[PDB]
Amino acid sequence: SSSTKKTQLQLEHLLLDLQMILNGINNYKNPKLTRMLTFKFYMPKKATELKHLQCLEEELKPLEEVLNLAQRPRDLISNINVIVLELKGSETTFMCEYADETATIVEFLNRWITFCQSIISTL
Numbered sequence: 001s002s003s004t005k006k007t008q009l010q011l012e013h014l015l016l017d018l019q020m021i022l023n024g025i026n027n028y029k030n031p032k033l034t035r036m037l038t039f040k041f042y043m044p045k046k047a048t049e050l051k052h053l054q055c056l057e058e059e060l061k062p063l064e065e066v067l068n069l070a071q072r073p074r075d076l077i078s079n080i081n082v083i084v085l086e087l088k089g090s091e092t093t094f095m096c097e098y099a100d101e102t103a104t105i106v107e108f109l110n111r112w113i114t115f116c117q118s119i120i121s122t123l
């Protein structure tokens with residue numbers, strides 16, 4: 001249907017934005033890179049369903065913060081939040097469970113990229 005296709009395009013969009021941020025990291029210089037890798041992100045214990053996207057939404061602020069230091073990020077992140085809101089909706093009440101171990105921005109982006117590919121595959 002067109003409802004599922006709309007969802008699929010939204011996920012492809014979110015995945016692409018995440019991948020673009022990740023690719024940007026390849027160009028950051030050394031002093032800069034080292035500092036940024038010590039900024040920690042919180043990871044979802046389980047992220048296999050759209051509702052789990054709240055675990056990404058709550059981490060968008062810290063994401064914006066680090067992206068501003070390493071440089072518009074305000075616009076990009078806002079756009080990602082819009083996609084996330086569209087995908088999980090605001091009707092479902094789910095509370096995010098985070099793992100104990102925090103992670104670098106690289107692992108954080110990789111995990112959400114995998115999440116996006118995982119949902120896309122089930123469609």
Ligand SMILES: COC(=O)[C@H](Cc1ccc(CCc2cccc3c(C(=O)C(=O)O)c[nH]c23)cc1)NC(=O)C[C@H]1CCCN(C(=N)N)C1
Pocket residue numbers: 031032033035036038039040041042059062066069070071
């Ligand atoms: C207790 O706090 C900590 O140990 C660290 C501290 C910290 C570590 C690193 C940084 C920054 C970053 C940075 C990024 C990009 C470029 C640069 C930079 C340069 O450009 C340069 O001068 O070369 C200097 N510093 C930079 C800012 C804060 N902060 C974090 O780990 C951030 C999390 C803290 C809790 C809430 N957070 C969350 N994910 N929910 C974020």
